[PDB]
């Protein structure tokens, strides 16, 4: 069974969906550690109540990106981790850290990439006026524009929607495709070919 780590910054609703799925009898993965860059958030309570240990690593206490990322990597090695999942982690990782984990780190984004990159995707979609939006799960690459896509799900926009109502609807889709993608990669069904392109068995 593959050992996994989940990194967060807030509430932890996606984290909970991942915990519940890896608990199922037929799962190929197991979550052994949860890390947050912010103290006292709700996501930490969720991890402790499921019997998973936690660690808080504050970016404000370091001199730069590389030193912060190195502190995180030390912990991943301590727990012999194989795969990393970014679930609401609001930081940009340095080049070398991304190189070391190439093909072994997944991220969730609230839009149908390549549309609406960056922060506040829902607000962007409403300003633009699309009638269809969605969510994406992808591998992380040295440039936030070429990460290979694994799975996507389209979500409709209703006239009259507010940022709060659209966010709620897209979140329900996120809880579906993130757990499904972790299982595809953990079982070897989906891999990143050495030609830099996605590959299915």
PDB file of C-alpha atoms in Angstrom, residues 33-36 43-45 47-48 52-56:
ATOM      1  CA  UNK A  33       0.694  12.560   7.878  1.00  0.00           C
ATOM      2  CA  UNK A  34      -1.051  15.949   7.447  1.00  0.00           C
ATOM      3  CA  UNK A  35       0.810  19.299   7.237  1.00  0.00           C
ATOM      4  CA  UNK A  36      -0.582  22.888   7.428  1.00  0.00           C
ATOM      5  CA  UNK A  43      -8.442  20.860   8.919  1.00  0.00           C
ATOM      6  CA  UNK A  44      -6.108  19.879  11.788  1.00  0.00           C
ATOM      7  CA  UNK A  45      -9.006  18.778  14.032  1.00  0.00           C
ATOM      8  CA  UNK A  47      -6.941  14.798  10.864  1.00  0.00           C
ATOM      9  CA  UNK A  48      -6.492  14.222  14.636  1.00  0.00           C
ATOM     10  CA  UNK A  52      -3.573  10.915  11.808  1.00  0.00           C
ATOM     11  CA  UNK A  53      -0.633  12.946  13.264  1.00  0.00           C
ATOM     12  CA  UNK A  54      -0.116  16.621  12.291  1.00  0.00           C
ATOM     13  CA  UNK A  55       2.659  19.282  11.986  1.00  0.00           C
ATOM     14  CA  UNK A  56       2.439  23.097  11.579  1.00  0.00           C
TER      15      UNK A  56
END
